[PDB]
Amino acid sequence: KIRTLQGRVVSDKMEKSIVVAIERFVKHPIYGKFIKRTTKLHVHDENNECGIGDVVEIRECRPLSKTKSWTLVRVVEKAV
Amino acid sequence: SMQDPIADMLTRIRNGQAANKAAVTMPSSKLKVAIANVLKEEGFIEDFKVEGDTKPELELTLKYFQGKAVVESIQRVSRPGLRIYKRKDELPKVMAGLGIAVVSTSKGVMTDRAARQAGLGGEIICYVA
Amino acid sequence: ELQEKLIAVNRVSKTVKGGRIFSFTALTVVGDGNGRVGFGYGKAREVPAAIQKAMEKARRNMINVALNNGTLQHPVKGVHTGSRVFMQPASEGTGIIAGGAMRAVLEVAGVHNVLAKAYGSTNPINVVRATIDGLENMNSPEMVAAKRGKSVEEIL
Amino acid sequence: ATVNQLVRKPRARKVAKSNVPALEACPQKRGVCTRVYTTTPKKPNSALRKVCRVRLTNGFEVTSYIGGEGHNLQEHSVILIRGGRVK
Amino acid sequence: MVTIRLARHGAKKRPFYQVVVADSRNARNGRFIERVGFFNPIASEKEEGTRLDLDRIAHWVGQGATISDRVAALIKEVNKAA
Amino acid sequence: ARYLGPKLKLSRREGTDLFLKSGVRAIDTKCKIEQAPGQHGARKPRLSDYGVQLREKQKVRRIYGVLERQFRNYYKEAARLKGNTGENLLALLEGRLDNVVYRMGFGATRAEARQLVSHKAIMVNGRVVNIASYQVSPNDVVSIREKAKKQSRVKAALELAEQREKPTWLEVDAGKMEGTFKRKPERSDLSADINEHLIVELYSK
RNA sequence: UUAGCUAGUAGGUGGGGUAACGGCUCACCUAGGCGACGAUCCCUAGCUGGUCUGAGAGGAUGACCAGCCACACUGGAACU
RNA sequence: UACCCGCAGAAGAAGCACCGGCUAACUCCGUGCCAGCAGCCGCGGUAAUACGGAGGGUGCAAGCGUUAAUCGGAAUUACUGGGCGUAAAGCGCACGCAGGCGGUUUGUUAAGUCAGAUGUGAAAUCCCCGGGCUCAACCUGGGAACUGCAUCUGAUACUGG
Ligand SMILES: [Mg+2]
Numbered sequence: 012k013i014r015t016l017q018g019r020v021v022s023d024k025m026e027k028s029i030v031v032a033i034e035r036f037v038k039h040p041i042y043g044k045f046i047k048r049t050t051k052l053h054v055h056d057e058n059n060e061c062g063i064g065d066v067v068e069i070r071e072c073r074p075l076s077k078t079k080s081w082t083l084v085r086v087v088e089k090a091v
Numbered sequence: 092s093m094q095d096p097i098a099d100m101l102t103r104i105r106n107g108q109a110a111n112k113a114a115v116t117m118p119s120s121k122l123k124v125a126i127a128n129v130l131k132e133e134g135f136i137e138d139f140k141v142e143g144d145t146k147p148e149l150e151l152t153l154k155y156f157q158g159k160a161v162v163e164s165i166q167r168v169s170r171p172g173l174r175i176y177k178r179k180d181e182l183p184k185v186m187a188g189l190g191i192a193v194v195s196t197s198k199g200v201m202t203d204r205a206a207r208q209a210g211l212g213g214e215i216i217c218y219v220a
Numbered sequence: 221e222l223q224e225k226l227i228a229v230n231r232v233s234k235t236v237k238g239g240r241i242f243s244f245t246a247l248t249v250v251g252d253g254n255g256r257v258g259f260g261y262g263k264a265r266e267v268p269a270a271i272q273k274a275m276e277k278a279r280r281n282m283i284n285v286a287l288n289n290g291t292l293q294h295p296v297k298g299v300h301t302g303s304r305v306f307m308q309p310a311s312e313g314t315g316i317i318a319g320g321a322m323r324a325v326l327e328v329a330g331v332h333n334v335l336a337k338a339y340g341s342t343n344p345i346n347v348v349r350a351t352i353d354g355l356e357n358m359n360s361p362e363m364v365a366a367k368r369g370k371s372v373e374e375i376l
Numbered sequence: 377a378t379v380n381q382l383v384r385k386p387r388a389r390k391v392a393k394s395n396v397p398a399l400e401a402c403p404q405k406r407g408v409c410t411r412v413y414t415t416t417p418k419k420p421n422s423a424l425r426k427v428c429r430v431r432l433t434n435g436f437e438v439t440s441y442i443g444g445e446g447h448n449l450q451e452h453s454v455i456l457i458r459g460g461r462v463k
Numbered sequence: 464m465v466t467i468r469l470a471r472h473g474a475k476k477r478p479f480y481q482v483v484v485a486d487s488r489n490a491r492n493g494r495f496i497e498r499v500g501f502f503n504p505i506a507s508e509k510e511e512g513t514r515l516d517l518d519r520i521a522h523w524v525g526q527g528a529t530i531s532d533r534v535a536a537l538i539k540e541v542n543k544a545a
Numbered sequence: 546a547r548y549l550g551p552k553l554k555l556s557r558r559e560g561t562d563l564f565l566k567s568g569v570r571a572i573d574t575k576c577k578i579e580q581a582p583g584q585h586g587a588r589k590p591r592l593s594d595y596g597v598q599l600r601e602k603q604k605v606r607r608i609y610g611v612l613e614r615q616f617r618n619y620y621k622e623a624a625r626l627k628g629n630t631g632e633n634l635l636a637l638l639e640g641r642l643d644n645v646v647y648r649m650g651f652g653a654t655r656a657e658a659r660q661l662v663s664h665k666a667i668m669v670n671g672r673v674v675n676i677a678s679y680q681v682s683p684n685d686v687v688s689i690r691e692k693a694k695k696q697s698r699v700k701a702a703l704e705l706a707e708q709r710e711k712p713t714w715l716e717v718d719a720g721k722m723e724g725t726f727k728r729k730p731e732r733s734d735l736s737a738d739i740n741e742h743l744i745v746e747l748y749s750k
Numbered sequence: 751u752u753a754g755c756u757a758g759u760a761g762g763u764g765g766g767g768u769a770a771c772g773g774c775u776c777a778c779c780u781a782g783g784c785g786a787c788g789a790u791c792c793c794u795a796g797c798u799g800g801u802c803u804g805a806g807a808g809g810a811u812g813a814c815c816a817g818c819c820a821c822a823c824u825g826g827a828a829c830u
Numbered sequence: 831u832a833c834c835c836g837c838a839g840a841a842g843a844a845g846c847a848c849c850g851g852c853u854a855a856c857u858c859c860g861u862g863c864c865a866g867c868a869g870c871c872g873c874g875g876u877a878a879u880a881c882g883g884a885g886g887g888u889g890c891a892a893g894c895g896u897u898a899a900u901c902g903g904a905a906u907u908a909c910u911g912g913g914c915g916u917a918a919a920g921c922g923c924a925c926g927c928a929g930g931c932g933g934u935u936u937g938u939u940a941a942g943u944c945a946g947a948u949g950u951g952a953a954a955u956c957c958c959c960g961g962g963c964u965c966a967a968c969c970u971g972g973g974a975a976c977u978g979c980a981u982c983u984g985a986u987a988c989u990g991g
Contacts, residue, residue, distance in 0.1 A: 014981090025761040025782055036942065036990090041808090041909055042379050044173060045942075045989095049787060053761085074772050076761070078783075093933055120934075122988075134368035146934080156367045163357075171931070173379060174989065176943050187294035187309075189364055189375060197944060197985045204376065211945050214988055304905090313629025315746040323594075332742060335805085339905060377912075380930060387907040389809085396898085403898040422863040422875080445865060445882085458897040463868070472954095473969055476831085477962095483953095492815060495953070501970080503962090510961070514971080546891070549844090558887095583886040585856050592854095599854055599889095613890065618966085642965090669964085676965050750903095 013070060015084060020065035021051065028079055029056045031067055053079040062089050095171045096120050101217055107153055108160040119149035125200040126193060126216065127151065133191055133202060135162055135219055164190065164220035178212035190220030222279070224250045225324040226271055228344050232263075247321070247345060248274040251328025255285035257355070259325070259348055283352065286360040290332040293361070298354030301346040307354055308335035321348040329355065396459045398436045407432045407440070409453040417462075425462070430455065464488070465496060465523065468531045479503050482515065482534060484523060502537065513541055548610060554582045559604050561738060567653045567705055598747045605739055609638055610655060615678065620748050631741035632732050639730050642669070643677035645687060649717045649724045650706020651699060666693035681726050688723040 022030035032051040039046060054067070055075040061067060065086060072082040093099075100123055107115040117123075119141050127139040127149060138152035154161040164186075169175035177183075177194075182203040185192045192203040196213030206212065228247040233240045244267050251257040258281055262274025286293070292309035299305070310317065310333040316326050318336035321344040326334055338347055365371050399405050407430040414424040426442040428449060440457045442449065449455070466487035473479035480502040485495040499516050506512025517538065524530070530538075548555075552565035553576040560579060562572070572578060580586045592600075606616050623633035638644065643659045646667070652658030661667055662677040668690045669679075681687075689699065703719065711717075713734055716725035732741065 022782090024780090026763090026780065028761050028782095030783090039383060039909090042382055043909065044379055044383055046383065046787090053783090055761095077758090077773060078760070080772090094931070096933075118934085125987075134370055154368075161367050163359075169988090171989095174943090176989095178944070189294060189361055195987045197987060199987055211985080213944055216988090313631060313633075313741065313745075315742040315749070317746070317749060337805095339911085377908085379909080382909080383930095387909090389907060394898095399898070401899065403896095420863090420872080421866095423866065424864090425866090443867095460869090460897075463870090463872090474963090477969075479969065481953095494817080498953075503970085505963085507962075511971090581887085583856090584858095585886075590855095596854055603854090603889095615966095672964065674964055679965050 013084075015068055015070050017066055017068050017087075018050075018052070020061050020063060020067050023056070023059065023061050023063050026059055027055060027057060028076070029054050029061050029067070029083070031069060031081075031083075052081050054081040054083055055079050056083055061086065062091070064091060065089050096123065097126070097216065098167050098170065100126070101165050101167055104151070104153075104162060105165045107151075108162050111155075111160075113153055113155075114150055115153060116148055116150040119143065119147035122195075122200075123149055125195075129193060129200055129202065130219065133219075135191075162219065164218065166218035166220075168192070168215045168217055175215045176213065177215055179207060179210055180212070182207055182212060183215070183218075185218050186220045190218065193217050193219060222250045222252045222256075223328050224248060224275060224278070225328060226274070227259075227321050227324055227348065229267060244270050246270045246274045247348070248278055249321075249325050249328055249348065250275065250278040250282075251325075251330065253328070253330035255287045255330065256282050257285060257325065257329045257352070258282040259352065261345065283356055285329060285355050286358060286363070287329070287331060291334055292331065293358060295335075296354045296358050298350035298352075300349035300353055301341070301343075303341040303343060303346040303350045304339040305347060305350040305354065306337045306339065307351070309333070310335045320344060322351050324348075325351050395461065398432060398434070398438050399457075399459065400434065404456050404458055405433055407438075407455050407457055409449060409451045409455060410437065412442075412449050412451055428455070430457065465526075465528050466531065467499070467520070467523075467528060467534050469502065469533060470495070477505055479505075482537075484520075484528070487529065513537055515541070517541070546612060548607075551582075555607050557582050557586070559600060559607070561604070563604075563608060565654060565656075567702075568708070569705075598743050601740060601743045602747050605638070605744060609641065609644060610659070611638075617748070620744075629732075629741065631745055634744070635732060635735060635739070636729050637680070639735070640680040641677075642667075642674060642679040642681055642687075645681055645715070645724070645726065648712050649687065649715055650702055650709065651689065651722065653698065653702040653705050657698065657702065661693070661699075664693070666690060666696075683726055683728060685726050686723055687726070688721065694722060 016033060018031040018033035020029055021032050030051060031054045032049050035048045035050055037046055037048055038044070052069070053076070054069050055072070056067075061083075066088055067083045068085045068087065069081050069083045072080060074080045075082065096118075100117060103115050103117055124139075124141055127136070127141075130136045131139060135154060136151055137154045140150040140152075142148055142150065182194065183192050184203075188204070193200065193216040194203050194206050194213050195216055196206055196209070196211055198209060198211065200216075201209065203215075226246060226248045228245070230245045230247075231242055232245055233242050235241070243263060243265055245261070245263045246267070247259065247261045248271060249257065249259040258278045260274040260276070260278030262270040262272070262277060264270035264273055288309065290312060292307065295306070295308035297304065297306040305322065307318075307322075312333055314333045316323055316331070316334050316336075318326060318334065318338075320338065320342055322336050322338065325348050326336070336351075338350075341347065359367075361372055361375060365375055368375070394401075409428050410431050411429040413427065413429070415427050417423055417425055426447065427439055428442060430438050430440050432438060438457075440455075441460075441462045464487050466485050467482065468485055468487075469480040469482055470485070470491050471478055472481050481495075481498060482500050482502050483495040484497040484499050489495070497519075499520055500514055503510075503512045515538065520528075520538070552563075553572070556563045556565060556572070557576055557578065558581055560581075566572070566575075606613070611619075619634060619637045623630045623637055626633045639648075643655060643662050646652055646658035646662065647655045652661055659677045662675065665673050665675055666689065667674060668688045669681075670685050671688070673690065693699070699722065703722075712730070714727045714730045716727050718724060
């Protein structure tokens with residue numbers, strides 16, 4: 012129901028914050044080729060619990076930090 | 092090496108017309124039969140004979156008319172390096188509709204004029220004229 | 221009734237020990253207003269003389285073209301010797317849209333409402349050879365019904 | 377011409393320049409006469425082409441052909457140029 | 464705030480008015496809010512001269528709209544003629 | 546914004562009939578009908594493809610006296626419309642008010658029809674229409690108003706209309722000096738010397 | 751022939767601040783942040799509806815009308 | 831003011847550019863690589879349709895030319911819609927990461943994709959059908975369109991997972 016997204020957990024080093032990159036898969040406006048395009052986001056996790064290199068599921072929230080307005084909701088396939 | 096069996100198929104059809112062969116064979120695929128069961132229905136081949144157990148082999152029968160060929164043109168629209176997805180309104184008219192355009196939509200494989208009457212677009216495979 | 225149009229007046233030369241022998245060459249096309257058309261490239265020592273040889277070539281060796289009512293039946297392209305030329309049927313009451321030799325060859329072909337475009341070499345000898353080849357293999361709905369073993373309504 | 381190369385690099389349409397840059401996209405520009413003289417042209421033609429070295433508005437020092445036959449031009453004179461090369 | 468005023472849209476010496484819902488701080492070229500009709504003072508015969516959606520107007524007065532002088536006159540005189 | 550020069554000089558250029566005078570005196574008794582005007586007018590050149598398309602369009606303009614820009618506006622209008630554009634174009638030419646007065650033969654020439662519309666002596670649906678280039682709607686009447694019914698150049702032009710072929714799409718009267726635009730004409734209802742497939746292509750380079 | 755850039759920077763905790771959330775500010779932690787999908791730096795530029803051309807694809811373009819933005823001798827700052 | 835009648839006479843009311851081919855339209859005379867002309871090719875070195883003048887003609891028109899400026903023609907950056915043996919162009923080869931690309935078959939997923947539906951995509955403009963100004967320009971009614979994006983419901987052939 013909620014406008015939620017997934018993506019790739021890139022960084023988990025800084026506290027209560029993870030970096031998640033998102034693949035948007037879009038047509039070129041002229042050449043028509045479908046391009047994998049990457050949108051990274053600073054996502055507020057709690058607990059610093061996310062393993063690096065992971066698929067998370069996120070949600071747009073009120074502005075948490077100077078570079079961070081995103082909070083996860085849940086985690087799929089945490090392992091390596 | 093093997094980047095497409097479909098572009099392999101159409102070229103083997105294309106080179107067999109000029110070679111004036113009566114039977115063009117190749118290993119078969121599930122998508123290959125779904126195309127080969129159109130052109131018999133659309134009247135561009137005469138027979139296809141899918142056989143083979145360990146590995147299915149599709150064997151075709153080329154349609155020739157007045158000595159010369161029937162397949163005047165055979166192309167590829169959605170190549171593996173560049174895919175084509177057109178809606179029901181942007182379905183083409185091959186040789187002003189006299190030829191046919193093979194489109195695969197969610198309702199299997201059919202021609203464009205059937206897909207217009209189906210009222211739903213999809214992935215245009217090739218042009219046959 | 222076979223209306224005739226000259227296309228090119230031209231002066232080529234051979235070279236001998238004495239000097240240069242100028243020779244005048246000419247390209248013509250004939251056509252009946254139906255789907256019968258034929259081109260002719262003549263050559264002599266004289267401008268009103270080489271055209272008659274150009275006509276006499278064109279009066280023979282004709283070609284039978286499946287027209288529609290006043291236009292083509294489907295767009296098609298035409299090539300001969302680097303002279304890629306695209307052509308296209310049009311709606312009624314728009315005239316011939318072409319240039320060079322292509323205006324002449326379609327007018328004796330008896331079409332009336334076309335779209336046409338030349339790419340590459342506009343050499344009037346090979347540009348009209350490309351028009352003919354595209355008009356030659358343009359085929360009827362009736363033939364492809366017979367070629368595919370169907371009817372017109374089984375094609376539409 | 378592969379579309380991946382076309383993705384990684386767009387078609388660079390060539391950028392053309394003006395052959396008449398001193399007007400700087402203007403129809404006409406005011407000028408000041410600096411030297412009025414004649415010049416022999418190149419090989420296929422033989423004349424004395426009346427011509428003037430011109431200080432412009434923007435400080436440019438150009439040469440500009442005097443059209444017509446006969447004129448009343450001096451140095452330190454205010455003229456107006458339209459363009460066009462002389463072959 | 465919300466206004467309904469007369470907006471000159473026509474040639475010189477021959478006026479024509481788009482009487483629309485607009486803003487009382489914006490302008491005639493610029494921002495309206497919603498186009499609720501038109502008016503011609505050179506409305507001749509065999510043609511309508513004032514075609515207004517007189518029910519969405521009642522929706523905005525219900526929201527507390529502001530009605531101009533001729534607009535209050537002509538909405539009356541439409542209802543005093545229709 | 547009118548042509549004012551010699552009429553038959555234009556006829557000598559295009560070589561054909563342009564109907565520019567009343568035809569009472571014979572046209573060949575007024576000009577050499579097959580010599581172009583001036584010095585080099587006898588010798589016919591091998592005239593090119595560009596010229597005959599120009600001469601065709603220069604014919605049709607000089608048939609109706611229409612300058613190039615205003616004629617181009619007819620081309621833009623006919624191209625916007627549907628079907629055969631030249632048939633649409635000739636309908637616009639037949640739609641002209643000063644044309645129909647000549648087609649009803651109220652003025653002896655088109656210029657003699659034009660001056661009447663200029664001098665306001667016409668009523669269209671009972672209304673005076675000063676514009677000569679006005680487009681005539683179907684099922685309308687074109688009446689001579691009663692100030693200038695008494696002009697001798699009106700009724701003599703009626704006899705010249707008797708000399709000409711009567712048009713078909715015009716319910717014309719005589720005793721009231723009025724008419725009625727029945728319907729639009731066809732290409733077939735006009736002459737055959739005007740090629741549809743040339744004036745289109747001239748403005749479609 | 752612009753490849754490294756960043757220290758309130760980047761995140762946290764706590765305090766403060768604003769109509770509002772948030773290095774918004776401060777303190778204290780943490781060393782992060784960013785970049786070859788062009789960061790950085792330089793040059794040029796108000797932006798869009800649109801306009802012009804082109805068969806289209808596109809290309810160029812932003813006077814007039816609009817929608818937004820920015821500016822008001824210059825540089826500053828608050829006031830109400 | 832719009833509009834309406836008188837008034838008077840053909841009256842008060844046409845000009846630029848062009849003619850060597852390109853591109854519609856030519857003679858004559860001056861001129862002699864001079865004077866010059868010139869978008870290009872190119873004309874003038876005593877017989878110039880290319881200079882200058884005249885005549886004649888062509889093109890437009892209350893304007894006509896030149897310059898500037900943008901696209902088109904130009905497929906001459908080729909998505910639509912190019913090429914690389916010698917006309918410009920395949921690295922001197924090999925390796926290989928990121929990268930792009932992927933046999934076959936079954937389920938799953940429904941991401942892409944397709945279909946439907948909601949929201950929005952302001953007005954103006956353009957298009958279509960009308961109307962109004964004597965028409966036209968212009969004004970204006972209605973429509974379509976605004977090629978999108980968001981959301982929801984599907985769809986399962988293909989491409990993904
Ligand atoms: Mg038409």
